[PDB]
Subunit: 158 residues, 2 copies
Amino acid sequence: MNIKTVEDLFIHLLSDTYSAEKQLTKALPKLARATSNEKLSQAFQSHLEETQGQIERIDQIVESESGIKLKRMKCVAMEGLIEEANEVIESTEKNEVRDAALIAAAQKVEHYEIASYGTLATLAEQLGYSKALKLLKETLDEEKQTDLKLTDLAVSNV
Amino acid sequence: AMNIKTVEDLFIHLLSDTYSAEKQLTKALPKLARATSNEKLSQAFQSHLEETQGQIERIDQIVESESGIKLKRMKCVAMEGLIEEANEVIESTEKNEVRDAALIAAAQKVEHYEIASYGTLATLAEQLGYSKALKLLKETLDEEKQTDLKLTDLAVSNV
Ligand SMILES: [Mg+2]
Ligand SMILES: [Mg+2]
Ligand SMILES: [Mg+2]
Ligand SMILES: [Mg+2]
């Protein structure tokens, strides 16, 4: 993290979010397998497909602006969120308690992303990145809908 | 490490995690308030501290409201990492609007970690029939969403 300008901050956070999404796609298959509820399992599989589209949006964002260039880095916060989900799996039997706990872990993941994309959209707008702003808002709305979905599942987990 | 056999245990685990997260956050907020030269953001950080104080008191009230809600001493590692990131922001920037932007971002990741946690706690409280916890948790949740919104206002106002 070496950041002097708003443009450097945008690149830094976009690079972070990019790493977070790639990590999350690696983890989602196991989350889908670890759940006993098939509706929740399919929500994890749907969320994987959506995350693929979101990573594609980042590529398009990079293409859209000269001097947007991603840095290779590991998003450590996402790394820890994913490990906490894996600790849930390790600490439970495959039942409705695991399900409740996996939804909770995944909503922290989604909320980390909701924050990140909200910030990215604000900064894109500030920097005059019009195409990027459009694409970032598309992801942000999807992240919000996924979280809502997960809440509906947590509530009908009774 | 964690051991969760029942919905009751899960709720205790997460309540305990959140309680640690809030205590850690109060330790961090004073430095965040000093680290910004923008007065409005500085004020938001001091307001957030006083608000978090009241949120910890709600958790004590939640704990008194139901027997067999007993908190476990644990360190919330996610909040620890989010606070570490805010501190790295301070060391990696000059004291200016760029720092402010980056601190607001770090603080919104904190708020959203708490929005998620409280949303889950309110769900499980309802399921468990902890009526008093439910209203307390919903109150904190509402405040957390307002704080995130105030921070968005400041993010956009940093232009
Ligand atoms: Mg995503
Ligand atoms: Mg997501
Ligand atoms: Mg709080
Ligand atoms: Mg908070």
